[PDB]
């Protein structure tokens, strides 16, 4: 977007919990445009969150998403002819996007048989501070702040 500022799309609220973050996670799970299958996967995963954890799955989901959000990342920049890894903060929308994308990607990396079990286990582990998505967050916050010397290339 060069001319305008590219305003953000407003998502419809969730049909169960009434949260737009849940709908965004549904969309990140969605594949080939199958909304019903993605919602089936996510709601069965919510059914798995209970009877495994006494807490309501909405709280677990939100706390896991909060645990996956990275505070700083690192972008490449061409300076003086070379390419440097410059660390800089992250806007909240990009925090949410990276959190949900990493949740889905790390969920599909699990050895669990069907999807709902994968999403449920990944959400639980990310809520209690482990899993592949938290590993991704830690790796990003390592790369960034591992190149602190380039912080004056913030831009």
């Amino acid at each position: 977007a060069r001319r305008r500022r590219a305003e953000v799309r407003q998502l419809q609220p969730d049909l169960v919990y009434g949260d737009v973050l849940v709908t965004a996670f549904i969309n990140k799970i969605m594949r080939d445009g199958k909304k019903n299958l993605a919602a089936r996967i996510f709601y069965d995963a919510c059914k798995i969150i209970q009877e495994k954890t006494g807490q309501e799955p909405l709280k677990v989901f939100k706390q896991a998403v909060e645990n996956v959000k990275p505070r700083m990342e690192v972008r490449s920049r061409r300076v003086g002819g070379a390419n440097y890894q410059v660390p800089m903060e992250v806007s909240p929308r990009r925090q949410q996007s990276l959190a949900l994308r990493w949740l889905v990607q790390a969920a599909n990396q699990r050895p669990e048989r069907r999807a709902a079990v994968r999403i449920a286990h990944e959400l639980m582990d990310a809520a209690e501070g482990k899993g592949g998505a938290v590993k991704k967050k830690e790796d990003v916050e390592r790369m960034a702040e591992a190149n602190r010397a380039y912080a004056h290339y913030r831009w």
Partner: protein, 119 residues
């Protein structure tokens, strides 16, 4: 082991490296640091963050001698001068004054070709 408790701080900041020497009020040094004392080896020494690390390391080395209040002296126009200033400013050490004492000649010696088109 001297227990100085008050001294001076010289900051030699250049485009290639920033180096901090903490001395006593008579000028005799106690400890020191630079970008090379920290793990940085090449051009990363002429970095404001490396200057901050060097300033904080020299300050912590001066804490062993039980020093509290300092007098900062700046020499040289280099990247990371003000960063070392702000590093020493809030580092447990009390900064009493900041003085720029960059040695400027009166057109005495001919500079290298890198610094020519002047005198």
């Amino acid at each position: 082991k001297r227990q100085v408790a008050s001294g001076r701080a010289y900051i030699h900041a250049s485009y290639n490296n920033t180096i901090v020497t903490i001395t006593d009020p008579d000028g005799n040094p106690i400890t020191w640091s630079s970008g090379g004392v920290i793990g940085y080896k090449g051009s990363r020494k002429g970095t404001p963050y490396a200057a901050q690390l060097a300033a904080l390391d020299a300050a912590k080395k001066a804490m062993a001698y039980g020093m509290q209040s300092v007098d900062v002296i700046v020499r040289g126009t280099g990247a990371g001068r003000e960063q070392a200033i702000r590093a020493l400013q809030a580092s447990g050490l009390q900064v009493k004054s900041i003085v720029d004492d960059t040695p400027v000649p009166h057109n005495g010696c001919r500079p290298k070709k890198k610094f020519r088109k002047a005198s």
